[PDB]
Amino acid sequence: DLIGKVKGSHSVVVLGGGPAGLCSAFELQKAGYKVTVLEARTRPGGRVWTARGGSEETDLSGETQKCTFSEGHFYNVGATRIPQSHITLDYCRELGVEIQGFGNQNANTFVNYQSDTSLSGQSVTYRAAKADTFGYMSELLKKATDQGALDQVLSREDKDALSEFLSDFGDLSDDGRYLGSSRRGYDSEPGAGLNFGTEKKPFAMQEVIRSGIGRNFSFDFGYDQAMMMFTPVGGMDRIYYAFQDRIGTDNIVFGAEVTSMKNVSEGVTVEYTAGGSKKSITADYAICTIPPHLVGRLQNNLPGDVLTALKAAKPSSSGKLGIEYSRRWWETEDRIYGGASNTDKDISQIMFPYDHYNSDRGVVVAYYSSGKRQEAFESLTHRQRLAKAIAEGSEIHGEKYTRDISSSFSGSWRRTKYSESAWANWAGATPEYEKLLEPVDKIYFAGDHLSNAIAWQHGALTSARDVVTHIHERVAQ
Amino acid sequence: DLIGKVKGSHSVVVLGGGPAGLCSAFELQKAGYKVTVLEARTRPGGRVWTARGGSEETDLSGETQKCTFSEGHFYNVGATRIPQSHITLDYCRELGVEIQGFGNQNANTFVNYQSDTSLSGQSVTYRAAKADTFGYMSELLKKATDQGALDQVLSREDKDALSEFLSDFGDLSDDGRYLGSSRRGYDSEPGAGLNFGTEKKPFAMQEVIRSGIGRNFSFDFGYDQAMMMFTPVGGMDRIYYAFQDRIGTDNIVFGAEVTSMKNVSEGVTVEYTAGGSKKSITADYAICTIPPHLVGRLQNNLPGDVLTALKAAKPSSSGKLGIEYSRRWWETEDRIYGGASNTDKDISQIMFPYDHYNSDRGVVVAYYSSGKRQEAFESLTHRQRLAKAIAEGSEIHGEKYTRDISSSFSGSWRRTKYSESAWANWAGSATPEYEKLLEPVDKIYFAGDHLSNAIAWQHGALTSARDVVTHIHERVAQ
Ligand SMILES: Cc1cc2nc3c(=O)[nH]c(=O)nc-3n(C[C@H](O)[C@H](O)[C@H](O)COP(=O)(O)OP(=O)(O)OC[C@H]3O[C@@H](n4cnc5c(N)ncnc54)[C@H](O)[C@@H]3O)c2cc1C
Ligand SMILES: Cc1cc2nc3c(=O)[nH]c(=O)nc-3n(C[C@H](O)[C@H](O)[C@H](O)COP(=O)(O)OP(=O)(O)OC[C@H]3O[C@@H](n4cnc5c(N)ncnc54)[C@H](O)[C@@H]3O)c2cc1C
Ligand SMILES: N[C@@H](Cc1ccccc1)C(=O)O
Ligand SMILES: N[C@@H](Cc1ccccc1)C(=O)O
């Protein structure tokens, strides 16, 4: 248990029913606090949003999209993947939310980059790219070692041990050269009898280096990205519907747009509009999880140095687009089951689904891009976004990318009401971040921006837990 | 799609209801052949065997094991993982057998090897082992490049490109040194506010190189092992129960031990014992999928050079042991969800389950060893296998490995009736003997994973079946 049982009658109002808000309310309720959550949207989860058939969204440009994905088919427009260390998995267990493997690495997906080589714009599988890169890397370090270049820092025994590793890691010939490998894959698959198949031949050392085909390999090593990675069966939003149900909808007001938040003699008073009607609630403490750039728009009595600190958490651009295909060509033709293709094109990456394997249809994330390469979609209409995503995807996966398209749905987080940002980018552990960890009398800020895991649910959930702990210790004093 | 309708009445007898035999029968039926499968066991699938509560097996030493795993819990004693290129996945689609991801790579599982270093017998997570190994590897190659050691094979522009990659790949400092990385993981997890967490510090360069903690990294790159990998929900044997159902149990005789196979005037006559009785069946053709070392034991009229060729496929040793734990300590304490720990100990590896994540119990494959390191278990009783498995596993995963044990079940394939081998190794390894056995012996065709270029993969058995059925069909067409 996070905290013990509270003695007496104590109330909290939670602004925002995303992960930080719902986790706060869940934990406070467990301990015996009175809690009310005010959420502007008509769904729980915030930047955890799962698009299915029937989903409707009107963005800040006034364009309304209506998702028409087939029954049971979806994609996560925000959060989609979870590493093994995150407390998100602990809450999945507590809430009874089934998880499954998320394909965050795949030998069969493609890399495709521009360069001053003949590989420019050419799709190469990860396994082929890796075998060539690690083959030539190993050959080069083995050459230097045999030449005696590392004799000052490696003993004879060190050199022999290193050589053994390099021959294995690079699949080097007996004389220490990279000549290609079964690790690259096969143009024709090995079968039975005298059907030996046909190995894919290697690129040259200069092609590999000058093409930069290994630029994305270190992604595999990210602490928060390395396999094994996980995701909830049926969508990430299931975590937050589970929180909703445990908290009880009697304790959550949806469609409730907060317009004012003030420290008062009697606690904290929050005004909000729900169903076109003006409402007000007062509680002993408030937990404000509204994104920091949106807090200054509220009528408030926050001190000037607090309003200035909130402005330091700069909005960031990111977005996604999902296409439902009526044929799972990526599985049938490319032998790709999950994972992502990676590119320097604006689409940035194409992410293939982790469910309905071997079914008749599925949703492909045709882009997940951020920063400059999301600015390139942000201002386009959905029809224009789709046309650009299909053109760029066809340059990676061929003309099959343009066929058997049923429907599509996009989100751009800077253009999304009640978000207007994918995640915070603090100006310059900064002074403004540290300032916002302190309560403003009875108002506490919480969210993934006030964590060391920004753009992870873990960040939001750990922020909620720390803030609930601080409120509880205060009440005990 | 393989073949398109046969004209008239034609019959095939299939010896063995493992993957090759069942795939053969399935495709022949679809084309309009009369087919009968004779299978010695009471289950379909052969070396694809899934142990669950109720499974009973008496091995060739006379020991009987009775599996008591909880309902829904199992492990694959043979085949368990499938790469994306294998036709096994295409048959899962055709048969409606749902698949899920198999965790074949995991940053959080452990490596544990003996060496003449302080890391000898110490468990290190894959992510820490990789971060140190690739960090120092990258430092050393950058050092050699800067020195001018590779000036005869790399241009100025190549060297800068290589240096850029190495700084990123090895997470090097600005001045080119490996000094640790967040990639190693954390002794305290980064949280909110000023809770930054604490990184795990790096081992020293000579320790890392001499420990051999990177000796298994290349496994990740195997053509048939690289992620993404897959497996059927509920057990690998689900493929072969699905084949069974499509073929029809009326066309499969279980508990049918074949004793004779002979070419005769009208085709092939196969004698077998079933229900205690000596029975005979004659068909136009035969497809023999019995493991090659067991074919010689049959009464037969095969030519001497075919009998000699069958002996070249030497049997091998492999086995597994599964333990059901009543607490999923690997998830709750070690944050391991699937994957395998790897070691030089006899157990060889410890494989964590890919289903029932976050649940209350699970089966861990406490060893999967082959060759010399399976010979260490072969002659042990199950109780002795378990003790050895727990002792060695506790040296990798701690005292927790010894607690919350509910039940266990093991298989050793050389000691398993109607297998007596995990898979074949051809002497001289195509070899002449392999080539010879691709030819029909009048109306008898051999099929199985040993007659493929994917030995020890279901893909080998299935492609062998499809090639042999195509040969028979083209011959019947004329
Ligand atoms: C593109 C993208 C990719 C991501 N990838 C990952 C990933 O794969 N895995 C991972 O774990 N996480 C990922 N995340 C991060 C994850 O979504 C966030 O960390 C998490 O949603 C943060 O929760 P929060 O409660 O701090 O904020 P939010 O989710 O933004 O919740 C804030 C809430 O406040 C509400 N609100 C706003 N204004 C008002 C108002 N005036 N009145 C009342 N309510 C209001 C909003 O509607 C919202 O529900 C991703 C997010 C995005 C957008
Ligand atoms: C430990 C191990 C791990 C493996 N790992 C993988 C993996 O993860 N993925 C994968 O794809 N493959 C794996 N395999 C390989 C896979 O199991 C085989 O490729 C496949 O089972 C071969 O099929 P088969 O029909 O050639 O032979 P078998 O499966 O051996 O079938 C032969 C059949 O003949 C029957 N038989 C024997 N004698 C008689 C008799 N006298 N009369 C009647 N019937 C008889 C047997 O009972 C059996 O059913 C593994 C196998 C083992 C043992
Ligand atoms: N955590 C988010 C944002 C992110 C993307 C890429 C790398 C790091 C951060 C995600 O996994 O998509
Ligand atoms: N195909 C078998 C045997 C094997 C083991 C390791 C590498 C190559 C193949 C398995 O996956 O276990």
Side-chain angles (χ1 to χ4, degrees), chain A residues 16 18-20 39-41 46-47 79-81 256 258 368 413 418 447-448 455-457 460:
Chain A
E39 170 53 40
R41 293 177 161 121
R47 281 176 277 142
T80 204
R81 57 194 167 192
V258 175
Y368 167 30
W413 288 97
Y418 309 124
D448 70 339
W456 296 101
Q457 295 161 277

PDB file of all heavy atoms in Angstrom, chain A residues 16 18-20 39-41 46-47 79-81 256 258 368 413 418 447-448 455-457 460, ligand 1:
ATOM      1  N   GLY A  16      -8.202  16.911 -14.300  1.00  0.00           N
ATOM      2  CA  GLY A  16      -7.705  16.043 -15.356  1.00  0.00           C
ATOM      3  C   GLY A  16      -7.835  14.581 -14.979  1.00  0.00           C
ATOM      4  O   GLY A  16      -7.374  14.154 -13.921  1.00  0.00           O
ATOM      5  N   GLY A  18      -6.518  12.033 -16.946  1.00  0.00           N
ATOM      6  CA  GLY A  18      -5.500  11.233 -17.606  1.00  0.00           C
ATOM      7  C   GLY A  18      -4.870  10.281 -16.598  1.00  0.00           C
ATOM      8  O   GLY A  18      -5.373  10.122 -15.480  1.00  0.00           O
ATOM      9  N   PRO A  19      -3.687   9.719 -16.927  1.00  0.00           N
ATOM     10  CA  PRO A  19      -3.023   8.778 -16.022  1.00  0.00           C
ATOM     11  C   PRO A  19      -2.666   9.361 -14.645  1.00  0.00           C
ATOM     12  O   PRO A  19      -2.914   8.718 -13.617  1.00  0.00           O
ATOM     13  CB  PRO A  19      -1.766   8.385 -16.805  1.00  0.00           C
ATOM     14  CG  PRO A  19      -2.168   8.481 -18.208  1.00  0.00           C
ATOM     15  CD  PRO A  19      -3.076   9.690 -18.270  1.00  0.00           C
ATOM     16  N   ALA A  20      -2.138  10.579 -14.599  1.00  0.00           N
ATOM     17  CA  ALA A  20      -1.761  11.160 -13.294  1.00  0.00           C
ATOM     18  C   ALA A  20      -2.991  11.405 -12.427  1.00  0.00           C
ATOM     19  O   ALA A  20      -3.003  11.093 -11.238  1.00  0.00           O
ATOM     20  CB  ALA A  20      -0.962  12.457 -13.476  1.00  0.00           C
ATOM     21  N   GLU A  39     -12.729  15.834 -15.649  1.00  0.00           N
ATOM     22  CA  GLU A  39     -12.080  15.591 -16.947  1.00  0.00           C
ATOM     23  C   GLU A  39     -12.827  16.293 -18.086  1.00  0.00           C
ATOM     24  O   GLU A  39     -14.039  16.092 -18.261  1.00  0.00           O
ATOM     25  CB  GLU A  39     -12.004  14.093 -17.204  1.00  0.00           C
ATOM     26  CG  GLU A  39     -11.579  13.694 -18.623  1.00  0.00           C
ATOM     27  CD  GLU A  39     -10.276  14.322 -19.101  1.00  0.00           C
ATOM     28  OE1 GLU A  39      -9.312  14.426 -18.303  1.00  0.00           O
ATOM     29  OE2 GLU A  39     -10.215  14.730 -20.289  1.00  0.00           O
ATOM     30  N   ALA A  40     -12.097  17.078 -18.876  1.00  0.00           N
ATOM     31  CA  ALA A  40     -12.694  17.884 -19.969  1.00  0.00           C
ATOM     32  C   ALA A  40     -13.279  17.028 -21.104  1.00  0.00           C
ATOM     33  O   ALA A  40     -14.275  17.409 -21.722  1.00  0.00           O
ATOM     34  CB  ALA A  40     -11.669  18.872 -20.538  1.00  0.00           C
ATOM     35  N   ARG A  41     -12.587  15.943 -21.460  1.00  0.00           N
ATOM     36  CA  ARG A  41     -13.022  15.065 -22.539  1.00  0.00           C
ATOM     37  C   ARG A  41     -14.172  14.167 -22.091  1.00  0.00           C
ATOM     38  O   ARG A  41     -14.453  14.041 -20.896  1.00  0.00           O
ATOM     39  CB  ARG A  41     -11.848  14.199 -22.991  1.00  0.00           C
ATOM     40  CG  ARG A  41     -10.733  14.986 -23.655  1.00  0.00           C
ATOM     41  CD  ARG A  41      -9.574  14.071 -24.012  1.00  0.00           C
ATOM     42  NE  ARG A  41      -8.666  14.636 -25.018  1.00  0.00           N
ATOM     43  CZ  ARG A  41      -7.361  14.852 -24.834  1.00  0.00           C
ATOM     44  NH1 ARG A  41      -6.850  15.024 -23.616  1.00  0.00           N
ATOM     45  NH2 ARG A  41      -6.568  14.996 -25.884  1.00  0.00           N
ATOM     46  N   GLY A  46      -6.520  10.792 -21.346  1.00  0.00           N
ATOM     47  CA  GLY A  46      -5.712  11.925 -21.818  1.00  0.00           C
ATOM     48  C   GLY A  46      -4.905  11.632 -23.082  1.00  0.00           C
ATOM     49  O   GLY A  46      -5.457  11.220 -24.107  1.00  0.00           O
ATOM     50  N   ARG A  47      -3.579  11.708 -22.966  1.00  0.00           N
ATOM     51  CA  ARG A  47      -2.674  11.388 -24.074  1.00  0.00           C
ATOM     52  C   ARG A  47      -2.539   9.873 -24.285  1.00  0.00           C
ATOM     53  O   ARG A  47      -1.937   9.443 -25.267  1.00  0.00           O
ATOM     54  CB  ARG A  47      -1.293  12.030 -23.864  1.00  0.00           C
ATOM     55  CG  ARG A  47      -1.286  13.507 -24.226  1.00  0.00           C
ATOM     56  CD  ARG A  47       0.050  14.138 -23.928  1.00  0.00           C
ATOM     57  NE  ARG A  47       0.162  14.516 -22.522  1.00  0.00           N
ATOM     58  CZ  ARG A  47       1.267  14.405 -21.783  1.00  0.00           C
ATOM     59  NH1 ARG A  47       2.421  14.001 -22.311  1.00  0.00           N
ATOM     60  NH2 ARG A  47       1.201  14.679 -20.485  1.00  0.00           N
ATOM     61  N   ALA A  79       0.303   6.800 -26.179  1.00  0.00           N
ATOM     62  CA  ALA A  79       1.029   5.706 -25.550  1.00  0.00           C
ATOM     63  C   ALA A  79       0.727   4.377 -26.212  1.00  0.00           C
ATOM     64  O   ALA A  79      -0.438   4.004 -26.319  1.00  0.00           O
ATOM     65  CB  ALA A  79       0.680   5.629 -24.053  1.00  0.00           C
ATOM     66  N   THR A  80       1.782   3.582 -26.436  1.00  0.00           N
ATOM     67  CA  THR A  80       1.614   2.273 -27.061  1.00  0.00           C
ATOM     68  C   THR A  80       2.526   1.144 -26.550  1.00  0.00           C
ATOM     69  O   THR A  80       2.186  -0.025 -26.708  1.00  0.00           O
ATOM     70  CB  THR A  80       1.754   2.360 -28.601  1.00  0.00           C
ATOM     71  OG1 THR A  80       1.056   1.256 -29.178  1.00  0.00           O
ATOM     72  CG2 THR A  80       3.242   2.344 -29.076  1.00  0.00           C
ATOM     73  N   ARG A  81       3.653   1.478 -25.920  1.00  0.00           N
ATOM     74  CA  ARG A  81       4.628   0.461 -25.532  1.00  0.00           C
ATOM     75  C   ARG A  81       5.167   0.699 -24.113  1.00  0.00           C
ATOM     76  O   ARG A  81       5.263   1.829 -23.654  1.00  0.00           O
ATOM     77  CB  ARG A  81       5.766   0.383 -26.560  1.00  0.00           C
ATOM     78  CG  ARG A  81       6.501   1.684 -26.792  1.00  0.00           C
ATOM     79  CD  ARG A  81       7.383   1.652 -28.044  1.00  0.00           C
ATOM     80  NE  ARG A  81       7.823   2.994 -28.389  1.00  0.00           N
ATOM     81  CZ  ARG A  81       8.403   3.317 -29.536  1.00  0.00           C
ATOM     82  NH1 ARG A  81       8.853   2.366 -30.340  1.00  0.00           N
ATOM     83  NH2 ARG A  81       8.664   4.587 -29.806  1.00  0.00           N
ATOM     84  N   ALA A 256     -16.172  17.985 -18.432  1.00  0.00           N
ATOM     85  CA  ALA A 256     -16.030  19.061 -17.454  1.00  0.00           C
ATOM     86  C   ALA A 256     -14.783  19.893 -17.707  1.00  0.00           C
ATOM     87  O   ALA A 256     -13.661  19.494 -17.340  1.00  0.00           O
ATOM     88  CB  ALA A 256     -16.006  18.470 -16.043  1.00  0.00           C
ATOM     89  N   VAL A 258     -12.513  22.651 -16.833  1.00  0.00           N
ATOM     90  CA  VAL A 258     -12.118  23.574 -15.769  1.00  0.00           C
ATOM     91  C   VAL A 258     -11.754  24.940 -16.356  1.00  0.00           C
ATOM     92  O   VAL A 258     -11.112  25.027 -17.400  1.00  0.00           O
ATOM     93  CB  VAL A 258     -10.911  23.032 -14.960  1.00  0.00           C
ATOM     94  CG1 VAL A 258     -10.417  24.061 -13.914  1.00  0.00           C
ATOM     95  CG2 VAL A 258     -11.254  21.711 -14.306  1.00  0.00           C
ATOM     96  N   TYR A 368       4.642   7.697 -37.346  1.00  0.00           N
ATOM     97  CA  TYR A 368       4.735   8.198 -35.982  1.00  0.00           C
ATOM     98  C   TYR A 368       5.957   9.094 -35.963  1.00  0.00           C
ATOM     99  O   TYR A 368       7.090   8.608 -35.992  1.00  0.00           O
ATOM    100  CB  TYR A 368       4.835   7.062 -34.964  1.00  0.00           C
ATOM    101  CG  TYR A 368       5.258   7.511 -33.560  1.00  0.00           C
ATOM    102  CD1 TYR A 368       4.932   8.781 -33.073  1.00  0.00           C
ATOM    103  CD2 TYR A 368       5.879   6.626 -32.692  1.00  0.00           C
ATOM    104  CE1 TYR A 368       5.230   9.156 -31.776  1.00  0.00           C
ATOM    105  CE2 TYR A 368       6.273   7.022 -31.428  1.00  0.00           C
ATOM    106  CZ  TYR A 368       5.973   8.304 -30.989  1.00  0.00           C
ATOM    107  OH  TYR A 368       6.233   8.651 -29.683  1.00  0.00           O
ATOM    108  N   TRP A 413      -0.827  15.875 -31.907  1.00  0.00           N
ATOM    109  CA  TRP A 413      -1.043  16.247 -30.510  1.00  0.00           C
ATOM    110  C   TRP A 413      -0.986  17.736 -30.204  1.00  0.00           C
ATOM    111  O   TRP A 413      -1.787  18.204 -29.412  1.00  0.00           O
ATOM    112  CB  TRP A 413      -0.096  15.461 -29.612  1.00  0.00           C
ATOM    113  CG  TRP A 413      -0.499  14.030 -29.510  1.00  0.00           C
ATOM    114  CD1 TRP A 413       0.004  12.979 -30.231  1.00  0.00           C
ATOM    115  CD2 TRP A 413      -1.642  13.522 -28.819  1.00  0.00           C
ATOM    116  NE1 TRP A 413      -0.720  11.845 -29.976  1.00  0.00           N
ATOM    117  CE2 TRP A 413      -1.690  12.131 -29.055  1.00  0.00           C
ATOM    118  CE3 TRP A 413      -2.621  14.104 -28.004  1.00  0.00           C
ATOM    119  CZ2 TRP A 413      -2.665  11.313 -28.496  1.00  0.00           C
ATOM    120  CZ3 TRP A 413      -3.529  13.278 -27.376  1.00  0.00           C
ATOM    121  CH2 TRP A 413      -3.550  11.896 -27.628  1.00  0.00           C
ATOM    122  N   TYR A 418      -7.246  20.041 -25.382  1.00  0.00           N
ATOM    123  CA  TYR A 418      -6.947  19.545 -24.017  1.00  0.00           C
ATOM    124  C   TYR A 418      -5.618  18.803 -23.906  1.00  0.00           C
ATOM    125  O   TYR A 418      -5.234  18.384 -22.807  1.00  0.00           O
ATOM    126  CB  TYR A 418      -8.100  18.713 -23.437  1.00  0.00           C
ATOM    127  CG  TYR A 418      -9.450  19.404 -23.512  1.00  0.00           C
ATOM    128  CD1 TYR A 418     -10.537  18.806 -24.156  1.00  0.00           C
ATOM    129  CD2 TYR A 418      -9.640  20.664 -22.955  1.00  0.00           C
ATOM    130  CE1 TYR A 418     -11.781  19.399 -24.167  1.00  0.00           C
ATOM    131  CE2 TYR A 418     -10.886  21.260 -22.959  1.00  0.00           C
ATOM    132  CZ  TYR A 418     -11.929  20.665 -23.637  1.00  0.00           C
ATOM    133  OH  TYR A 418     -13.170  21.266 -23.634  1.00  0.00           O
ATOM    134  N   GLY A 447       2.096  15.257 -13.032  1.00  0.00           N
ATOM    135  CA  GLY A 447       2.003  14.837 -14.443  1.00  0.00           C
ATOM    136  C   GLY A 447       3.338  14.345 -14.938  1.00  0.00           C
ATOM    137  O   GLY A 447       4.342  14.449 -14.241  1.00  0.00           O
ATOM    138  N   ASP A 448       3.378  13.810 -16.155  1.00  0.00           N
ATOM    139  CA  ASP A 448       4.638  13.227 -16.618  1.00  0.00           C
ATOM    140  C   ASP A 448       5.728  14.276 -16.832  1.00  0.00           C
ATOM    141  O   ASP A 448       6.911  13.949 -16.720  1.00  0.00           O
ATOM    142  CB  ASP A 448       4.466  12.347 -17.873  1.00  0.00           C
ATOM    143  CG  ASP A 448       4.140  13.137 -19.135  1.00  0.00           C
ATOM    144  OD1 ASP A 448       3.652  14.285 -19.038  1.00  0.00           O
ATOM    145  OD2 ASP A 448       4.313  12.575 -20.244  1.00  0.00           O
ATOM    146  N   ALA A 455       6.998  11.698 -21.199  1.00  0.00           N
ATOM    147  CA  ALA A 455       6.491  10.927 -22.348  1.00  0.00           C
ATOM    148  C   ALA A 455       6.482   9.423 -22.052  1.00  0.00           C
ATOM    149  O   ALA A 455       6.410   8.609 -22.978  1.00  0.00           O
ATOM    150  CB  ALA A 455       7.269  11.230 -23.639  1.00  0.00           C
ATOM    151  N   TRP A 456       6.386   9.070 -20.768  1.00  0.00           N
ATOM    152  CA  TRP A 456       6.068   7.719 -20.325  1.00  0.00           C
ATOM    153  C   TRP A 456       4.966   7.774 -19.274  1.00  0.00           C
ATOM    154  O   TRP A 456       5.044   8.586 -18.342  1.00  0.00           O
ATOM    155  CB  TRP A 456       7.301   7.022 -19.743  1.00  0.00           C
ATOM    156  CG  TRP A 456       8.385   6.815 -20.732  1.00  0.00           C
ATOM    157  CD1 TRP A 456       9.509   7.564 -20.879  1.00  0.00           C
ATOM    158  CD2 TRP A 456       8.409   5.831 -21.775  1.00  0.00           C
ATOM    159  NE1 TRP A 456      10.275   7.062 -21.906  1.00  0.00           N
ATOM    160  CE2 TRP A 456       9.650   5.963 -22.433  1.00  0.00           C
ATOM    161  CE3 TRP A 456       7.580   4.757 -22.114  1.00  0.00           C
ATOM    162  CZ2 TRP A 456      10.014   5.144 -23.498  1.00  0.00           C
ATOM    163  CZ3 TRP A 456       7.903   3.997 -23.229  1.00  0.00           C
ATOM    164  CH2 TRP A 456       9.124   4.172 -23.886  1.00  0.00           C
ATOM    165  N   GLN A 457       4.044   6.818 -19.335  1.00  0.00           N
ATOM    166  CA  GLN A 457       3.016   6.683 -18.309  1.00  0.00           C
ATOM    167  C   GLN A 457       3.683   6.561 -16.940  1.00  0.00           C
ATOM    168  O   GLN A 457       3.177   7.091 -15.963  1.00  0.00           O
ATOM    169  CB  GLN A 457       2.111   5.477 -18.589  1.00  0.00           C
ATOM    170  CG  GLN A 457       1.303   5.610 -19.862  1.00  0.00           C
ATOM    171  CD  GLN A 457       0.793   4.277 -20.345  1.00  0.00           C
ATOM    172  OE1 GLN A 457       1.515   3.517 -21.022  1.00  0.00           O
ATOM    173  NE2 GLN A 457      -0.434   3.960 -19.975  1.00  0.00           N
ATOM    174  N   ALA A 460       3.996   9.875 -15.250  1.00  0.00           N
ATOM    175  CA  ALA A 460       2.725  10.362 -14.718  1.00  0.00           C
ATOM    176  C   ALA A 460       2.323   9.627 -13.442  1.00  0.00           C
ATOM    177  O   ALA A 460       1.857  10.249 -12.482  1.00  0.00           O
ATOM    178  CB  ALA A 460       1.636  10.228 -15.760  1.00  0.00           C
TER     179      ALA A 460
HETATM  180  C1  LIG C   1       2.584  10.486 -29.317  1.00  0.00           C
HETATM  181  C2  LIG C   1       2.752   9.962 -27.908  1.00  0.00           C
HETATM  182  C3  LIG C   1       3.495   8.797 -27.694  1.00  0.00           C
HETATM  183  C4  LIG C   1       3.633   8.258 -26.418  1.00  0.00           C
HETATM  184  N1  LIG C   1       4.340   7.078 -26.226  1.00  0.00           N
HETATM  185  C5  LIG C   1       4.344   6.461 -24.971  1.00  0.00           C
HETATM  186  C6  LIG C   1       4.528   5.087 -24.859  1.00  0.00           C
HETATM  187  O1  LIG C   1       4.600   4.343 -25.865  1.00  0.00           O
HETATM  188  N2  LIG C   1       4.396   4.500 -23.608  1.00  0.00           N
HETATM  189  C7  LIG C   1       4.158   5.251 -22.478  1.00  0.00           C
HETATM  190  O2  LIG C   1       4.102   4.689 -21.376  1.00  0.00           O
HETATM  191  N3  LIG C   1       3.721   6.535 -22.641  1.00  0.00           N
HETATM  192  C8  LIG C   1       3.838   7.149 -23.873  1.00  0.00           C
HETATM  193  N4  LIG C   1       3.253   8.381 -24.046  1.00  0.00           N
HETATM  194  C9  LIG C   1       3.150   9.260 -22.837  1.00  0.00           C
HETATM  195  C10 LIG C   1       1.841   9.139 -22.066  1.00  0.00           C
HETATM  196  O3  LIG C   1       0.744   9.256 -22.944  1.00  0.00           O
HETATM  197  C11 LIG C   1       1.845  10.247 -21.015  1.00  0.00           C
HETATM  198  O4  LIG C   1       3.012  10.126 -20.215  1.00  0.00           O
HETATM  199  C12 LIG C   1       0.642  10.248 -20.086  1.00  0.00           C
HETATM  200  O5  LIG C   1      -0.555  10.278 -20.849  1.00  0.00           O
HETATM  201  C13 LIG C   1       0.742  11.473 -19.191  1.00  0.00           C
HETATM  202  O6  LIG C   1      -0.340  11.502 -18.281  1.00  0.00           O
HETATM  203  P1  LIG C   1      -0.736  12.880 -17.543  1.00  0.00           P
HETATM  204  O7  LIG C   1      -1.872  12.566 -16.618  1.00  0.00           O
HETATM  205  O8  LIG C   1       0.482  13.532 -16.957  1.00  0.00           O
HETATM  206  O9  LIG C   1      -1.223  13.871 -18.726  1.00  0.00           O
HETATM  207  P2  LIG C   1      -2.378  13.733 -19.853  1.00  0.00           P
HETATM  208  O10 LIG C   1      -2.459  12.328 -20.363  1.00  0.00           O
HETATM  209  O11 LIG C   1      -2.177  14.845 -20.863  1.00  0.00           O
HETATM  210  O12 LIG C   1      -3.733  14.026 -19.048  1.00  0.00           O
HETATM  211  C14 LIG C   1      -4.129  15.346 -18.740  1.00  0.00           C
HETATM  212  C15 LIG C   1      -5.645  15.400 -18.695  1.00  0.00           C
HETATM  213  O13 LIG C   1      -6.079  16.729 -18.410  1.00  0.00           O
HETATM  214  C16 LIG C   1      -7.260  16.955 -19.150  1.00  0.00           C
HETATM  215  N5  LIG C   1      -7.512  18.392 -19.251  1.00  0.00           N
HETATM  216  C17 LIG C   1      -6.847  19.295 -20.046  1.00  0.00           C
HETATM  217  N6  LIG C   1      -7.379  20.518 -19.810  1.00  0.00           N
HETATM  218  C18 LIG C   1      -8.423  20.377 -18.953  1.00  0.00           C
HETATM  219  C19 LIG C   1      -9.368  21.271 -18.438  1.00  0.00           C
HETATM  220  N7  LIG C   1      -9.374  22.578 -18.730  1.00  0.00           N
HETATM  221  N8  LIG C   1     -10.320  20.772 -17.593  1.00  0.00           N
HETATM  222  C20 LIG C   1     -10.351  19.453 -17.205  1.00  0.00           C
HETATM  223  N9  LIG C   1      -9.474  18.570 -17.781  1.00  0.00           N
HETATM  224  C21 LIG C   1      -8.502  19.045 -18.587  1.00  0.00           C
HETATM  225  C22 LIG C   1      -7.015  16.246 -20.475  1.00  0.00           C
HETATM  226  O14 LIG C   1      -8.189  16.039 -21.243  1.00  0.00           O
HETATM  227  C23 LIG C   1      -6.301  14.975 -20.018  1.00  0.00           C
HETATM  228  O15 LIG C   1      -7.171  13.857 -19.847  1.00  0.00           O
HETATM  229  C24 LIG C   1       3.059   8.903 -25.326  1.00  0.00           C
HETATM  230  C25 LIG C   1       2.292  10.057 -25.548  1.00  0.00           C
HETATM  231  C26 LIG C   1       2.143  10.589 -26.825  1.00  0.00           C
HETATM  232  C27 LIG C   1       1.233  11.779 -27.013  1.00  0.00           C
END
